[PDB]
Amino acid sequence: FRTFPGIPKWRKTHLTYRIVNYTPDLPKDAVDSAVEKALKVWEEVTPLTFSRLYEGEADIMISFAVREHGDFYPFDGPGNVLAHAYAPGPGINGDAHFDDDEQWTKDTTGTNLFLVAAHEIGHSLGLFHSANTEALMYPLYHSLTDLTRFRLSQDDINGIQSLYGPPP
Ligand SMILES: O=C(O)[C@H](Cc1c[nH]c2ccccc12)NS(=O)(=O)c1ccc(N2CCC(c3ccccc3)CC2)cc1
Ligand SMILES: [Ca+2]
Ligand SMILES: [Ca+2]
Ligand SMILES: [Ca+2]
Ligand SMILES: [Zn+2]
Ligand SMILES: [Zn+2]
Numbered sequence: 197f198r199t200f201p202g203i204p205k206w207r208k209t210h211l212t213y214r215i216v217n218y219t220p221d222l223p224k225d226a227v228d229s230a231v232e233k234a235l236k237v238w239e240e241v242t243p244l245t246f247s248r249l250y251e252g253e254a255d256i257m258i259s260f261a262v263r264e265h266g267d268f269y270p271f272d273g274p275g276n277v278l279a280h281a282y283a284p285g286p287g288i289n290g291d292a293h294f295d296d297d298e299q300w301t302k303d304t305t306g307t308n309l310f311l312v313a314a315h316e317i318g319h320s321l322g323l324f325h326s327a328n329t330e331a332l333m334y335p336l337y338h339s340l341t342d343l344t345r346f347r348l349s350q351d352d353i354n355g356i357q358s359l360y361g362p363p364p
Contacts, residue, residue, distance in 0.1 A: 197355030214254035
């Protein structure tokens with residue numbers, strides 16, 4: 197596992213998130229479900245808890261956008277970068293953005309939203325990239341034949357608990 201330089205982390209255990217907008221590609225229930233399953237992956241192995249805000253500024257602001265969208269790293273149309281997220285901190289830090297020039301899916305065939313979201317929230321929490329080809333934080337996208345096989349590797353658990361510790 198790898199952390200970000202300077203090891204940014206949250207110095208609090210109760211985090212908030214807001215889904216500011218939604219993709220055309222899936223019903224809202226499917227997107228909500230994907231992000232909350234992605235949050236839950238990290239909750240289970242840490243002391244962190246997340247709660248949702250429907251207005252105002254949350255710690256982790258989640259949005260869908262294309263091309264130039266108000267930061268230093270515009271998206272690039274279909275393919276290539278699917279999404280990105282920022283390390284812990286105020287303002288844009290912690291936020292996760294998804295490229296809506298992708299076609300987001302809940303299945304194992306397209307660009308799966310849950311898998312990408314789980315990875316991106318790993319960044320939001322302070323994890324960088326792993327060399328382990330089995331890890332969630334490996335830098336190259338791929339999916340699975342069976343999503344029910346999905347699991348955090350020991351590497352991901354070790355990395356995140358190195359920031360926040362194990363669950364009480
Ligand atoms: O790394 C990224 O997020 C960069 C942009 C990027 C490049 N430097 C960065 C530094 C900090 C934050 C973001 C970036 N976007 S990206 O769209 O290229 C991207 C998105 C998701 C992933 N996955 C890795 C494998 C994972 C998996 C694991 C186990 C089983 C099944 C599936 C599924 C998701 C990787 C890369
Ligand atoms: Ca933020
Ligand atoms: Ca793209
Ligand atoms: Ca789209
Ligand atoms: Zn962005
Ligand atoms: Zn990444």
